[PDB]
Amino acid sequence: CQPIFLNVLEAIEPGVVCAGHDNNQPDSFAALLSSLNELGERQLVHVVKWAKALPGFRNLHVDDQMAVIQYSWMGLMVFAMGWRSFTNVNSRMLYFAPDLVFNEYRMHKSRMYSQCVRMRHLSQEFGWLQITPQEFLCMKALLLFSIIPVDGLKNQKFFDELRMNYIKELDRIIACKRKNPTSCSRRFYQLTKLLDSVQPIARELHQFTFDLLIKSHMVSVDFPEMMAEIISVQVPKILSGKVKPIYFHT
Numbered sequence: 001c002q003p004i005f006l007n008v009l010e011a012i013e014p015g016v017v018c019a020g021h022d023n024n025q026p027d028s029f030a031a032l033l034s035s036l037n038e039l040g041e042r043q044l045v046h047v048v049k050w051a052k053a054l055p056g057f058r059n060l061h062v063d064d065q066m067a068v069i070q071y072s073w074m075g076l077m078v079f080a081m082g083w084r085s086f087t088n089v090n091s092r093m094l095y096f097a098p099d100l101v102f103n104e105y106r107m108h109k110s111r112m113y114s115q116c117v118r119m120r121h122l123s124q125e126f127g128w129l130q131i132t133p134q135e136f137l138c139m140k141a142l143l144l145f146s147i148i149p150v151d152g153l154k155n156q157k158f159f160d161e162l163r164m165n166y167i168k169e170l171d172r173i174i175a176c177k178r179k180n181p182t183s184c185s186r187r188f189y190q191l192t193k194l195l196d197s198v199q200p201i202a203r204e205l206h207q208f209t210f211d212l213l214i215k216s217h218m219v220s221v222d223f224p225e226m227m228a229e230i231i232s233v234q235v236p237k238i239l240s241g242k243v244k245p246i247y248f249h250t
């Protein structure tokens with residue numbers, strides 16, 4: 001029951017990343033979405049660096065390393081975002097960045113109102129569930145290993161070993177605080193269900209961004225190339241079902 005794994009996750013947790021949005025200019029659909037894309041791009045860099053420092057991660061095949069990242073990035077972003085929205089604005093608003101927060105007016109002006117409401121649900125679960133900052137970190141890590149191609153990775157064996165241990169860490173951080181037996185058996189059920197909620201949501205964001213990408217040109221929203229590239233190559237595989245989420249309760 002020693003904190004070594006937790007020290008690592010807290011040690012690697014990324015810092016405050018600013019979107020670089022002009023909060024002194026009147027709201028707009030394209031200015032809100034272009035900023036979200038620039039924010040996406042910069043948070044990807046962090047995710048890249050955050051992931052490569054994970055216990056066991058660097059033993060995975062290079063492409064597999066690069067793959068689970070691209071496939072799971074949206075869900076990590078949504079999940080982290082929902083956490084910031086819980087600890088910073090008590091879930092009523094979406095804390096994408098300190099300088100890019102969505103009040104209800106923006107959720108609508110940006111035209112992601114329905115997805116926004118879905119993400120706000122998520123941010124609200126943290127509250128109703130009483131997620132400890134430790135359960136959070138463990139879950140955010142596990143998410144990375146939550147979405148894989150339908151055959152497998154070019155060495156599925158290790159991924160599956162990595163995935164199994166992270167589950168154990170999550171199990172550890174539950175049994176290493178309060179009650180036992182029925183209390184933590186159900187506390188585990190609850191979190192895995194919570195983990196599962198991220199996928200549908202991430203799915204929706206995937207659909208939207210892809211659509212936003214093909215429309216981009218004629219609707220003046222800008223996409224940073226690294227991201228534009230991931231949306232156009234890796235995202236289609238998810239929307240088409242060639243890469244699928246791994247649920248706990250399927």
Ligand SMILES: C[C@]1(O)CC[C@H]2[C@@H]3CCC4=CC(=O)CCC4=C3C=C[C@@]21C
Nearest residue numbers: 033036037039040077078081096205209
């Ligand atoms: C606007 C859009 O293209 C569609 C959905 C958007 C996603 C929604 C989820 C999200 C959460 C964050 O905390 C980082 C920014 C972020 C996004 C940035 C750009 C995207 C991909």
